[PDB]
């Protein structure tokens, strides 16, 4: 009751409802901006919900599965824009995370908001699809977009990629088919380059992407450690 979670200056009933709302909004819009503390708590709920959904999907035990389903239902507000949220959770969202052991969200810190000095953050779903089956781009996966923008900038400058950038790319890849990842990167480039107004010679960009993928995939002192005399 003290120390188990953030209180967030709200009465228990209100607080829980707020958290549910945040979770619903995260599932609907695959990224959302909010205050840092709220985002942190919301992540805990959303991740829990995702795991329960995964458990329901997997389990052979019928009773268990039913219980998981009931728990998931309890943890959401299913109305208006979130009428078919349960369906989405089972069919669209939870199947992304079957291999991933936890860590389905990422809270990314922003510069604190000016009017309030409140620490601001971006709660968002990990490995959200950047491109739907229709020829558009999807709202979400901000980190990936940022990475690709950084890559583009490095290419423009004719500089080597930073170790941190490479590490991030590797992390992104870990639960991604290589060809799919490449195609996503290419798609992101097309939009990003146009926005920034750099020229998109396609074959060269593809080659660069391929090169970036290759280095990611193929893995390759002051004090001396000496035994006791």
């Amino acid at each position: 009751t003290v120390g188990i979670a953030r209180k967030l200056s709200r009465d228990k009933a209100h607080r829980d409802a707020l958290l549910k709302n945040l979770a619903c909004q995260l599932f609907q819009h695959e990224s959302i901006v909010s205050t840092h503390a709220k985002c942190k708590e919301a992540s805990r709920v959303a991740e829990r919900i995702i795991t329960w959904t995964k458990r329901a999907i997997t389990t052979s035990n019928s009773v268990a599965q039913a219980e998981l389903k009931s728990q998931i239902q309890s943890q959401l507000f299913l109305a208006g824009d979130n009428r078919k949220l349960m369906k989405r959770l089972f069919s669209e969202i939870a199947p992304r995370y079957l291999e991933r052991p936890g860590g389905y969200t990422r809270v990314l810190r922003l510069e604190p908001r000016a009017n309030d000095s409140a620490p601001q953050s971006v709660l968002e779903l990990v490995d959200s699809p950047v491109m739907s089956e229709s020829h558009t781009v999807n709202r979400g996966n901000l980190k990936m977009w940022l990475l690709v923008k950084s890559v583009i900038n490095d290419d423009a400058n004719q500089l080597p990629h930073n170790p941190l950038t490479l590490q991030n790319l590797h992390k992104v890849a870990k639960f991604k088919a290589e060809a799919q990842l490449h195609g996503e990167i290419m798609l992101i480039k097309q939009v990003l380059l146009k926005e920034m107004s750099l020229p998109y010679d396609e074959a060269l960009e593809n080659e660069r992407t391929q090169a970036l993928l290759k280095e990611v995939y193929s893995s390759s002192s002051s004090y001396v450690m000496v035994p006791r005399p």
């Binding site: 810190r109 940022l146 930073n162």
Partner: protein, 112 residues
């Protein structure tokens, strides 16, 4: 409960500015953004790049505006007859001039 004397210039100033707690600190923890080579806070996203990405998302993930057929296919004269102009209130006018009271985000300096 109440101050016994007029607090002097010295004693108010040493109270306010003497302690380091009360002073402002240099923001040493700035560093370069990898997407655009500009200043940003450490362990923080660049507000320009994330803003740009948000804008891109908005432009792509855009719910189409509902233009009713009957109003779209009105004649100009007919439209004027139906929906004439009006004097807005002082309050309304003030609300309309958003650039007076609404702060757009500033761009940081380019890192060296």
């Amino acid at each position: 409960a109440v101050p016994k004397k007029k607090v002097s210039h010295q004693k108010k100033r040493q109270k306010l500015y003497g302690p380091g707690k009360k002073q402002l600190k240099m923001i040493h923890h700035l560093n370069k953004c990898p997407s655009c080579g500009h200043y940003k806070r450490a362990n923080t996203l660049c507000m320009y790049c994330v803003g740009q990405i948000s804008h891109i998302w908005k432009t792509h993930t855009a719910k189409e505006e509902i233009k009713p057929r009957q109003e779209e296919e009105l004649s100009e004269l007919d439209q004027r007859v139906l929906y004439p102009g009006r004097r807005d209130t002082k309050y309304t006018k003030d609300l309309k001039d958003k650039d007076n009271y609404l702060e757009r985000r500033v761009r940081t300096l380019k890192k060296d």
